[PDB]
């Protein structure tokens, strides 16, 4: 069923998600713990971002790659703000998870407070995303539109990944693994 996934998704977004603008567009951003949040790599945050229409400094940013050097399509960023995020690392899986029912949550000025039942999530692993070899790719059927990147892919009790791309038929998430936030 879908209800409990939506229930989890709405509560998660309310506590931990925000709308972010960089020079490269507008994205959903998920806070993970302390002042560390995650964005799609192609958001390419500069020294300042707009977070819920307010200027926020970036203290540090990390474009994640695997131990082999392969792109993961995620950027971790540390925000210059006093408030800490609710620690949601316990809702991240230690390995890539496949599910029969997932929900994708988007929150930007173009897609405010929207949730999409995406159905089955399949771990495709190593893929080529627009020329760039990328691994730990989760794939789901989705009539994708631009402006949805940073979307948070969830199932009941788990944050599975961050939406980083689409081709109009499938959507693609980078798996959000717990060890990224050691």
Author numbering: -1 to 180
Authors' own words:
The genus Enterovirus comprises numerous human pathogens, including rhinoviruses, polioviruses, echoviruses and other human-infecting viruses like EV-A71 and EV-B93. Coxsackie virus 3C protease, like other enteroviral proteases, is a cysteine protease with a characteristic specificity for glutamine in the P1 position of its substrates. Thus, for this target, fragments binding to the S1 pocket are biomimetics of the glutamine side chain, while the active-site nucleophile is the thiolate of cysteine 147 (Cys-147).
